[PDB]
Design a protein around this ligand. Sequence first.
Ligand SMILES: N[C@H](c1ccc(-c2ccccc2F)cc1)c1nccs1
Length: 137
Amino acid sequence: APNVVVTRLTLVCESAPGPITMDLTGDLEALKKETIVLKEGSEYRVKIHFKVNRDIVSGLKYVQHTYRTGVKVDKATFMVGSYGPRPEEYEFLTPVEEAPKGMLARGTYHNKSFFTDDDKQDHLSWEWNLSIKKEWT
Ligand SMILES: N[C@H](c1ccc(-c2ccccc2F)cc1)c1nccs1
């Protein structure tokens, strides 16, 4: 196994009716067909779960590109930092944001995420899609 293994992404969202999560050790091609529903304007954080198996690592970074029709790609980079090896996964959470709101902001957002580091290692790259809706259903 590699030293760094990305295991899961969770959208932390107090107001959501149920868990919003994806197993990133699974089939990343199938993951593209999933659609996460977020009610417009909901507060959320992105939580990345990962394991460090063998050696202390430094300079971890989470990079998230969000595509939306008609708008320039939104590119966000987060410093994740240094972690030692242990059996239990670590969790990194982005700062809280407000999901888009209004009828013109509803519908599909396409995300491409990267877990990487100062050494530009591809710990994991993955796509996942979000649908912003008026209600949770
Ligand atoms: N600011 C918007 C934008 C940015 C991020 C998200 C988002 C990404 C992951 C989880 C939940 C989210 F709400 C949605 C909309 C964009 N502007 C230009 C392209 S995307």
